[PDB]
């Protein structure tokens, strides 16, 4: 179970946006930390809409399953306040927010080494999940959090974490899944029961496209029906302007799930582009 956090110790501040059937807020948690020292800690607060309390189980098991596995590239969940009528997940507050917004805002100031480093870290996370046979189910740039920016002073690389998957696509409405093309793989658009470790290899390739497309969203110009016909016609995504990773993107986004390479293989491919 998650460590239950008192409503009394949670302060909700500015709205940061919304997720799939969720409201997200910046907040502060009053807690007793190491050595009995009192802290007021910045927290990310994800609230499940009162209008969609049906997905609470998935909304919370998505964080639970990942939280039992500690890893430097996986987001830290502090606990949950079932604040009465509300279902609230309390998470590590990352300084620089989402990768997709960071890529858009800093498109002209991001080189290939920066993108390689971020891809290697994300693949390391996914490899760790693969070794544990844990399916994420929603790998995308929005679910990558920037802990530290690159530092030209000390040449330090950036550092990222993978966030929780949110409500599983197995229970999400059909219209939500279709909107998530091309992050949801073709076999899951055909049948969500096909959720598999191979799903995350496809989505990982889609996310590599985002990292190389400076924040663009692939197929954003296509409505849901045309996104479906994109999979029907078995099309592949266009090569990004920075095409250094185009081959890996296409190799991951294989219409045959069984042919998608292991994340061990993916990592060795990334290490070879130097
Ligand atoms: C100058 C503008 N910036 C940063 C360049 C910010 O406003 C900002 C936003 C969010 C954080 N922090 C954050 N964000 C998350 O998710 C991403 C958010 C979900 C809802 C959509 C908006 C992003 C998180 N998930 C788990 N811990 C999280 N911590 C820090 C800063």
Numbering used by the authors: 536 to 809
What does the publication say?
JAK2, like other JAK family members, comprises a catalytically active C-terminal tyrosine kinase domain (JH1), a regulatory pseudokinase domain (JH2), and a Src homology-2 (SH2)-like domain that, together with the N-terminal FERM (N-terminal 4.1, ezrin, radixin, moesin) domain, forms the major receptor interaction moiety. The JH2 domain has a key role in mediating both negative and positive regulation of JAK kinase activity and numerous disease mutations locate in JH2, including the prevalent hyperactivating JAK2 V617F in MPN. Previous studies have demonstrated that JAK2 JH2 binds ATP and possesses regulatory autophosphorylation activity on Ser523 and Tyr570.
Four hits, i.e., diaminotriazole compounds 1 and Cdk1/2 inhibitor III, and aminopurine analogs Cdk2 inhibitor IV and 7 bound JAK2 JH2 (V617F and wt) and JH1 domains with IC50 values at or below lower detection limit of assay (3.5 µM). Since the compound binding does not induce significant changes in the ATP pocket, we compared the regions around residue 617 and the helix Cα between WT and V617F structures. In structures complexed with 6, 36, and 16, a WT-like conformation for the phenylalanines was observed. Interestingly, the packing of F617 against F595 observed in the V617F-ATP complex was not evident in any of our structures and the residue often displayed poor electron density suggesting high flexibility.
